Amino acid sequence: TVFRQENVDDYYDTGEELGSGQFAVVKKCREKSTGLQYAAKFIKKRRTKSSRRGVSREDIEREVSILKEIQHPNVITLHEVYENKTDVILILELVAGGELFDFLAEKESLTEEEATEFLKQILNGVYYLHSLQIAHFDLKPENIMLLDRNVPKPRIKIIDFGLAHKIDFGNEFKNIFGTPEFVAPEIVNYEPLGLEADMWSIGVITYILLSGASPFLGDTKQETLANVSAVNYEFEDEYFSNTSALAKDFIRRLLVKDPKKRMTIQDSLQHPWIKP
Ligand SMILES: CN1CCN(c2cc(-c3ccncc3)c(Cl)nn2)CC1
């Protein structure tokens, strides 16, 4: 598939940088014809078929295909796509309230109500994706963005579909691997992957939201991965002494090694800690 090859600077003005990644940079932009603002994500293309730098065209096309299908309050949307010889440029919805990660750093930890306010939205977004057989594969606080961080109950959107895949056969067996602290055991062990991997990540996010601590974090990436595979985590009393047993129950049913025994997104929405 081919994208718009006109110079993006002919249609948009760019501003402040909103994010920087291994092969991507995000800049705030404004469309000249409407005055509306967006987030422009510049993704570096591979220069040769046998290169490790840049993103393969197959990977870029997959991300765009997935982004073009989604429209939900809790997920980012795609406005337009441009490309030149160096980059593919995604013009995405602007989410200007910052990362959930940064919001958490400001509060240290959240009350159960504050945590479930965010979690309900994350679950709603993931329910939408899973309904479409889309696995995100990179859920973490840095990939959750608030629309406005200065309101009592912030609205959030899931971003960064760079690792997302359609799961048409129940599982996929590809080169997929995200951030060590949030990946499921099946990712660590290079086993077939499905929608269940996202549910594990949600369990990790929940633990962090309630305690301010990462459940499997080791001193090195390899130690973290080994901890994940062994399901080496516990609820430290210092952090969870006043956390309800039902919150712990929710987490416990997500941080399960066997994906077939882990709660599904539908199960999580009906769990007594979440169900209103
Ligand atoms: C893991 N990080 C990668 C770099 N980040 C980001 C942030 C954004 C974004 C989207 C909408 N509004 C503002 C920013 C985008 Cl589009 N890509 N990566 C932040 C998360």
From Swiss-Prot:
Q: In what way is this protein post-translationally modified?
A: Ubiquitinated by the BCR(KLHL20) E3 ubiquitin ligase complex, leading to its degradation by the proteasome.
Induction cue = Up-regulated following treatment with IFNG/IFN-gamma.
Residues at the active site:
138 (proton acceptor)
Q: Found in which tissues? A: Isoform 2 is expressed in normal intestinal tissue as well as in colorectal carcinomas.
Write down the superkingdom of origin: Eukaryota
- What region holds the Protein kinase domain? 12-274
Result of changing residue 41 to A: Loss of activity, apoptotic function and of autophosphorylation
Which residues hold ATP? 18-26, 41, 93-95, 99, 160
Q: How does it assemble?
A: Interacts with KLHL20. Interacts (via death domain) with MAPK1 and MAPK3. Interacts with MAP1B (via N-terminus). Interacts with PRKD1 in an oxidative stress-regulated manner. Interacts with PIN1, PDCD6, BECN1, TSC2 and STX1A. Interacts (via kinase domain) with DAPK3 (via kinase domain). Interacts with GRINB. Interacts (via death domain) with UNC5B (via death domain). Interacts with UNC5C (via death domain).
Reproduce the free-text note on domains from the UniProt record.
The autoinhibitory domain sterically blocks the substrate peptide-binding site by making both hydrophobic and electrostatic contacts with the kinase core.
Q: Which family does it belong to?
A: Belongs to the protein kinase superfamily. CAMK Ser/Thr protein kinase family. DAP kinase subfamily.
Question: What is its biological role?
Answer: Calcium/calmodulin-dependent serine/threonine kinase involved in multiple cellular signaling pathways that trigger cell survival, apoptosis, and autophagy. Regulates both type I apoptotic and type II autophagic cell deaths signal, depending on the cellular setting. The former is caspase-dependent, while the latter is caspase-independent and is characterized by the accumulation of autophagic vesicles. Phosphorylates PIN1 resulting in inhibition of its catalytic activity, nuclear localization, and cellular function. Phosphorylates TPM1, enhancing stress fiber formation in endothelial cells.
Q: What is this protein called?
A: Death-associated protein kinase 1
* Upper lineage: Eukaryota, Metazoa, Chordata, Craniata, Vertebrata
Report which part of the complete sequence is shown.
2 to 277 of 1430
